[PDB]
Design a protein around this ligand. Structure first.
Ligand SMILES: CCC1=C(C)/C(=C/C2=NC(=C\c3[nH]c(/C=C4\NC(=O)[C@H](C)[C@H]4CC)c(C)c3CCC(=O)O)/C(CCC(=O)O)=C2C)NC1=O
Lengths: 54, 160
């Protein structure tokens, strides 16, 4: 048994830990606000209807 | 109305309408078609103006819809957009009526202490109203934009 066989090759990924996701989190909050606004418009339309005209 | 204000001044002084009051009323009646045009443009685009105003105000102040914010939640954001729609409708009323009375009796008397009790941040309301003003001026010509901006700025000033 005399070929050079490489068993434990290092992986591409670096040893560091996961980077923080604060900016991504704020942008997701912005998308959530935009999505909330369109449903809020429907409920607000329901809010402006007259009182006792059922 | 301009007519109501003039007649109330005459009545409080127990006199007929003066030449100046008559000229005021004549000017208002002459401006009527321009007022109706501006008000019609604002009324036809209420949804767009309010949707854009809410977008701009929440973008400038994300804390309002963040947890712990005044408008946080579906019902509270609905009430906020509903208030913006209310103020736009009142601005159309002021434009048609030629004075600020409809905006006063319907929406500005007591709004300050109302928003104070509910901890509604008035700078955020002013931001939403300025956003609505810009959305509106986008739809109106420069002269119509100036006319509507008179009442928008009145609402802004009365909030502060
Ligand atoms: C037709 C004339 C008229 C006006 C003008 C009016 C304003 C108004 N808005 C209210 C609530 C509210 N108004 C708002 C909107 C504000 N909070 C957000 O942060 C924004 C900064 C801002 C809007 C741009 C919110 C969130 C509430 C609910 C707050 C609570 O439940 O305490 C209330 C208390 C009653 C209710 O809950 O419906 C009034 C009287 N009501 C009227 O009948």
């Amino acid at each position: 048994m005399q070929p050079i066989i490489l068993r434990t090759l290092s992986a591409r990924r670096p040893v560091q830990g996961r980077p923080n996701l604060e900016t991504y989190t704020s942008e997701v909050e912005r998308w959530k606000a935009i999505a909330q606004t369109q449903y809020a418009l429907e409920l607000a339309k329901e809010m402006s209807r007259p009182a006792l005209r059922t | 109305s301009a007519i109501t204000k003039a007649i109330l001044n005459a009545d409080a002084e127990a006199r007929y309408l003066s030449p100046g009051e008559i000229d005021v009323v004549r000017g208002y009646l002459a401006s009527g078609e321009r007022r109706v045009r501006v008000a019609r443009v604002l009324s036809d685009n209420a949804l767009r103006i309010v949707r854009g105003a809410g977008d701009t105000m929440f973008q400038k102040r994300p804390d309002l819809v963040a947890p712990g914010g005044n408008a946080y939640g579906e019902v509270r954001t609905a009430k906020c957009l509903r208030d913006l729609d209310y103020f736009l409708r009142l601005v159309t009323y002021g434009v048609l009526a030629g004075d600020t009375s409809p905006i006063d009796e319907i929406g500005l008397i007591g709004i300050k202490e109302t928003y104070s009790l509910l901890e509604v941040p008035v700078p955020g309301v002013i931001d939403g109203i300025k956003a609505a003003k810009q959305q509106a001026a986008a739809l109106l010509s420069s002269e119509d934009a100036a006319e509507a901006s008179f009442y928008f700025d009145y609402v802004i000033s009365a909030m502060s």
